[PDB]
Ligand SMILES: *[C@@H]1O[C@H](CO)[C@@H](O[C@@H]2O[C@H](CO)[C@@H](O)[C@H](O)[C@H]2NC(C)=O)[C@H](O)[C@H]1NC(C)=O
Ligand SMILES: *[C@@H]1O[C@H](CO)[C@@H](O[C@@H]2O[C@H](CO)[C@@H](O)[C@H](O)[C@H]2NC(C)=O)[C@H](O)[C@H]1NC(C)=O
Ligand SMILES: *[C@@H]1O[C@H](CO)[C@@H](O[C@@H]2O[C@H](CO)[C@@H](O)[C@H](O)[C@H]2NC(C)=O)[C@H](O)[C@H]1NC(C)=O
Ligand SMILES: *[C@@H]1O[C@H](CO)[C@@H](O[C@@H]2O[C@H](CO)[C@@H](O)[C@H](O)[C@H]2NC(C)=O)[C@H](O)[C@H]1NC(C)=O
């Protein structure tokens with residue numbers, strides 16, 4: 001399963017990012033860049049211009065009608081509004097699902113990075129402090145024994161090699177903090193956006209239902225209030241279309257080159273080869289951690305051989321401080337367990353799956369949901385324009 | 398993230414399973430057992446009895462009305478039907494999402510098991526065939542050299558140890574086939590179920606819309622066909638409630654003890670320690686594969702030591718057919734790569750995540766969707782009962 005850009009992503013990416021004063025920006029995902037933000041603002045301003053044109057057209061139509069089948073038009077408008085609200089519910093659910101998929105992927109990546117850091121730090125601190133303490137305690141036990149201290153200093157050098165090899169592993173403390181911040185911000189924004197769109201759907205349904213009630217019961221003050229709220233809802237729906245279009249364009253622009261964006265943004269705290277390994281994930285047997293993991297496992301194996309040989313030969317001679325030998329053997333066993341867990345976590349599979357899940361959430365689900373919310377906004381605008389244009393005819397009966 | 402049974406699961410599991418002849422049957426999940434299937438059939442028969450009682454009540458009410466505000470009742474029935482169809486859409490989407498989550502989890506577990514089997518088989522066949530061929534070819538190269546053949550036979554014994562250790566790993570060929578069959582069946586059943594419920598929603602909405610149309614236009618002939626279709630839709634909705642209730646009870650009974658069910662069903666194909674390891678993720682415990690992976694890595698390290706020492710020493714003397722030594726070194730490098738990939742894949746994390754994702758799909762999403770579909774069925778039955786009971790009054794005006 002390798003990522004491939006969907007069709008709608010590459011259609012939306014083809015949308016000219018033209019900026020404010022009609023100057024073509026390069027249209028490559030780069031938030032913070034003035035030109036890209038200006039292109040998004042230009043899309044928002046285009047949607048606002050469409051809103052202004054629609055309001056002007058509605059005002060002109062009402063002026064012409066009031067200075068110069070309607071039930072069928074009202075029924076058609078209500079049906080179109082109901083279809084729009086259904087499409088909006090579908091799009092809102094899809095966008096929320098995509099955002100939550102991204103949140104889960106980020107949380108899983110954060111958990112894996114924190115686990116890698118925890119094992120690295122624990123193994124290093126253990127093999128330093130506890131091992132040096134045990135060897136120092138054994139130092140006096142093996143009194144006047146040249147070979148039995150040569151083997152202990154060999155153990156010390158091998159532990160130093162272990163610590164040196166582990167220290168060369170990437171530290172994900174910064175990356176965990178960035179992922180936590182991104183996850184919290186995504187959760188906050190997604191919650192507020194879903195709540196706002198749910199309130200918009202509820203308001204739209206209430207307005208349509210009360211307008212139908214006023215049509216049935218021939219209300220006078222009720223209908224005027226519903227038309228005022230209809231103008232307000234048309235304004236709000238065009239603003240929602242602006243937001244949905246800008247967000248969808250930005251999302252498609254990012255999703256065209258997600259690996260490129262991730263490589264560029266993570267040049268600081270993550271090495272290039274590690275990022276390429278976790279993003280493209282070649283099955284060609286080339287892992288940046290392979291050499292250090294092999295060195296660590298060889299060092300652990302060697303120390304186990306020396307400690308086992310010492311235990312086999314120290315019992316006939318001393319048999320006094322063998323509790324320290326068993327403690328060291330247990331420490332090496334736990335270190336090998338930590339080795340297996342680490343070489344499992346530093347593997348591509350989990351992080352590549354998390355990255356692919358995040359991309360699927362924010363492109364296959366989030367972007368489709370944004371498109372459907374834009375379709376909702378356009379359909380609601382059309383329905384409410386039809387409701388307002390057929391306004392005076394029902395008002396004058 | 399550890400699995401915990403939700404509240405609604407333990408409420409639904411508390412539902413008595415009393416069989417057909419009112420004999421209490423065990424509530425533990427056992428689809429193959431006859432008594433459990435009889436309890437599910439009893440739940441279906443209870444729902445059918447409720448359907449029959451509702452039909453009898455409707456017939457009695459119509460007989461009383463036809464042998465002896467209505468617009469408000471029709472509007473209330475239409476509103477309740479619309480709410481029911483919305484709840485049914487939500488439940489259908491949720492159930493489909495849960496089933497697809499289960500399908501994805503099963504596919505991921507299948508991919509991991511297939512990869513483990515592929516690495517094991519490839520490494521075994523390589524270390525047998527290619528290594529024996531290279532050593533046999535080197536046999537004549539090191540003619541009349543006892544030490545350089547003792548080292549080669551040592552390499553042969555270490556390769557045999559590698560093959561023996563790898564052969565002790567579980568073979569997932571059977572589990573792969575079972576997972577493929579389960580995923581295919583789940584996909585087929587989910588597709589057909591979603592299509593059937595979508596058709597039911599479409600039919601219900603069409604019937605309600607045409608009934609509302611005939612209410613205003615006073616077309617009695619169409620409303621007789623709509624009454625017949627309403628009786629049929631009430632029957633179908635009660636059948637759907639039967640299916641949803643039985644499936645929800647079965648799902649809750651399974652989900653109370655998913656670990657127990659998985660352990661009991663997978664007793665011969667998979668060793669019990671392996672199942673416990675991948676189900677209760679023993680991060681603080683131990684891995685059943687740790688000993689064999691340690692033996693395999695130690696063997697690879699040893700053989701690399703002998704081959705490196707031989708290459709360092711054989712080139713100055715012979716320098717003939719040393720491409721075989723480089724090929725053996727490349728083979729050992731690829732074998733260490735396969736070792737790292739295997740010890741990554743045989744880890745607990747990936748399979749435990751797949752299992753937890755499957756449980757979340759079929760319990761947090763599938764069961765909730767089934768409950769909402771049952772609520773849809775009950776609400777649609779109530780709405781159509783209200784539509785039929787207010788039948789003769791609108792018919793006779
Ligand atoms: C991401 O992982 C980090 C681990 O580094 C989590 O941070 C810890 O969170 C626990 C939970 O309250 C705190 O008790 C610790 O003090 C935190 N430690 C550090 C170093 O921050 C973090 O919560 C995780 N975030 C997510 C969203 O999973
Ligand atoms: C550290 O691990 C080793 C190997 O697992 C333990 O040595 C024994 O190894 C044999 C394998 O030939 C096992 O059958 C024994 O069960 C192991 N001993 C025990 C007590 O389990 C070694 O004992 C471990 N270290 C400690 C402190 O227990
Ligand atoms: C589960 O994994 C198995 C691998 O053992 C897949 O089976 C292979 O599928 C490919 C795809 O067409 C075939 O070309 C092979 O002949 C199959 N091999 C065997 C041994 O069956 C299977 O497709 C996977 N299933 C899912 C749902 O992912
Ligand atoms: C198998 O791997 C070893 C170790 O990676 C290769 O030996 C060289 O090891 C040093 C590390 O001290 C690397 O810097 C060299 O790049 C390695 N050599 C090469 C050619 O890359 C050994 O060469 C590998 N086997 C083969 C056939 O290339």
Ligand SMILES: *[C@@H]1O[C@H](CO)[C@@H](O)[C@H](O)[C@H]1NC(C)=O
Pocket residue numbers: 026028
């Ligand atoms: C956009 O930027 C990329 C990278 O900086 C560059 O390769 C590309 O040529 C730019 N586009 C244009 C039209 O110059």
Ligand SMILES: *[C@@H]1O[C@H](CO)[C@@H](O)[C@H](O)[C@H]1NC(C)=O
Pocket residue numbers: 028030264267
């Ligand atoms: C990242 O993108 C910016 C803007 O296109 C560019 O200036 C910079 O060189 C890029 N970084 C890398 C490492 O290519």
Ligand SMILES: *[C@@H]1O[C@H](CO)[C@@H](O)[C@H](O)[C@H]1NC(C)=O
Pocket residue numbers: 423424425
């Ligand atoms: C159901 O079976 C389990 C195990 O076979 C048993 O422990 C339990 O008591 C049984 N249920 C009843 C009600 O006896």
Ligand SMILES: *[C@@H]1O[C@H](CO)[C@@H](O)[C@H](O)[C@H]1NC(C)=O
Pocket residue numbers: 425427661664
């Ligand atoms: C599996 O469940 C059946 C039915 O409850 C029981 O008879 C059997 O002993 C169980 N298997 C195991 C291994 O417990």
